[PDB]
């Protein structure tokens, strides 16, 4: 799609804006076990580099000598790498939060101080008398909300991957 | 800004889809008192109409007789109305959830059945011995993440309002 690649630049920009927004939203203090996408700090640099790539693709659209043509291919390749990584980690963390956890990555020190007596990955009270209690309903709401965050991030990352794959297939 | 009206429509429809995603994200069952922005279903029709307006601004871009030129002004005016409305609901609901509740609107029947024994607007335990307990930390995390969603939705609505106000400034 070489017709309005400028619009795809704005697509990448908006995707970076929402990626950094979701990254900031993920670090709300909840449990000492942060999501696997949070401790790796993927959303921050992912959105920053998405913004960089969109700015590069939607700045001049002319035949620059070295500053743009030479760097466009490497930025696009890095974008594909980052997008496939984001997809992989998102669909891995979905199973991590829905199925039994198989990596236990600790949260950041400054965010875990506020809520150090809480966990979110597993919550089945040792006392079955609390099954119909707000203590478990709150954790269920936390898990559902986090899964929604993961799903929206995953679908947006997949769309970004498709768009940048189209950009690369345009530029051999 | 008349140089790139095609990309402005893409930005508008991206903002609309982000609003739709946030609205669907806020429908997770948490407390019988749903946020004021959800019980009125503002994100649904608002986002759909942002889609429509942005698509209209970035479909033809030619001198159409009646389909495009005549409807563009009314679509933009409706966009400004909905954007200022969304700003008003966001500013109201932030103080609703963070300071005190002054408009109490119940959640939908089909979503409140899953979690009917839980509340998030005023969660201060009646027994002070539970202050340092996960039962309050869970609600604190719920409130913090809801406030974050409200803030990001507010900033997206404000940016979209600015963009569409500039568009109306272009088209007297």
């Amino acid at each position, epitope marked *: 799609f070489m017709r309005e690649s400028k619009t795809l630049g704005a697509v990448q920009i908006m995707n970076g804006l929402f990626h950094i927004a979701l990254g900031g939203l993920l670090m709300i203090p909840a449990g000492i076990y942060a999501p696997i996408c949070v401790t790796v700090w993927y959303p921050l640099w992912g959105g920053i580099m998405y913004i960089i790539s969109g700015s590069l693709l939607a700045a001049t659209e002319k035949n620059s000598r070295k500053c743009l043509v030479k760097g466009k291919m490497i930025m696009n390749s890095l974008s594909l790498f980052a997008a496939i990584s984001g997809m992989i980690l998102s669909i891995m963390d979905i199973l991590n939060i829905k199925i039994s956890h198989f990596l236990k990555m600790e949260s950041l020190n400054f965010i875990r101080a506020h809520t150090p*007596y809480i966990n979110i990955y*597993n919550c089945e*009270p040792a*006392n*079955p*008398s609390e099954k119909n209690s707000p203590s478990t309903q709150y954790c269920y709401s936390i898990q559902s909300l986090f899964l929604g965050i993961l799903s929206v991030m995953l679908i947006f990352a997949f769309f970004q991957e498709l768009v940048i794959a189209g950009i690369v297939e345009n530029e051999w | 800004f008349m140089r790139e009206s095609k990309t402005l429509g893409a930005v508008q429809i991206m903002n609309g889809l982000f609003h739709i995603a946030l609205g669907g994200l806020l429908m997770i069952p948490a407390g019988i008192y749903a946020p004021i922005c959800v019980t009125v279903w503002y994100p649904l029709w608002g986002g759909i109409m942002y889609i429509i307006s942005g698509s209209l601004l970035a479909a033809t871009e030619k001198n159409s007789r009646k389909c495009l030129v005549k409807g563009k002004m009314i679509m933009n005016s409706l966009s400004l109305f909905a954007a200022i409305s969304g700003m008003i609901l966001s500013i109201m609901d932030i103080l609703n959830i963070k300071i005190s509740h002054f408009l109490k609107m119940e959640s939908l029947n089909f979503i409140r059945a899953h979690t009917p024994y839980i509340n998030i607007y005023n969660c201060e335990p009646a027994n002070p011995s539970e202050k340092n307990s996960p039962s309050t930390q869970y609600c604190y995390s719920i409130q913090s993440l809801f406030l974050g969603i409200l803030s990001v939705m507010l900033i997206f609505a404000f940016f979209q309002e600015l963009v569409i106000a500039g568009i109306v400034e272009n088209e007297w």
Partner: antibody
Amino acid sequence: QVQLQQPGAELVKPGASVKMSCKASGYTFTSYNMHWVKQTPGRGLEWIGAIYPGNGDTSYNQKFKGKATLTADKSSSTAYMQLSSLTSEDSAVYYCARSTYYGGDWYFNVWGAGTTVTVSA
Amino acid sequence: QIVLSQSPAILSASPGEKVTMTCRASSSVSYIHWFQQKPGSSPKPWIYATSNLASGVPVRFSGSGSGTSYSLTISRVEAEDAATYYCQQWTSNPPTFGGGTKLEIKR
């Protein structure tokens, strides 16, 4: 006056099934929980699960989720723990201790005598 | 699952002398519980809520500590306390007991 009564001990052949008993008296059997623990000298004392006689709900752990099952009845005010697939490495002491929300968190008010199971042919 | 480790595994304390044992955890548990057991007997509860004392306890014992580190303090240890002390928590499912400090009389 609150106390929990448990049988002394019994012998179980490997691969068989055994049922535990823990009779409660002096307090409401329905209201309080029926936590069970297992103590082994080699690896210390570890949790095995719990059962609520009020609603019949049971909770376990992923380590021994299917090894043991819990079933209690409010008619006799007794809780029954059934073990499946006995193994020679399952020769330890099983305790029956109730749990109460005392002092601001869950606390084991009283314990039981415990059964010293033996798995040998 | 939260693992609890306490050191030393075995310590010897002279009668009528202050002795302190520590129980650290891999996570900041909200509260800690201390239990002691005697040979051929069930582990009787000893300390609850990290600051209070169970019924039938000598006044000498006094548990304290906050955060990820908790310690047990004995004003005057005697031969009557020749048992093993267990560290227990209730923050995360499932609760995990400690290793055990076997008190020894050093005369």
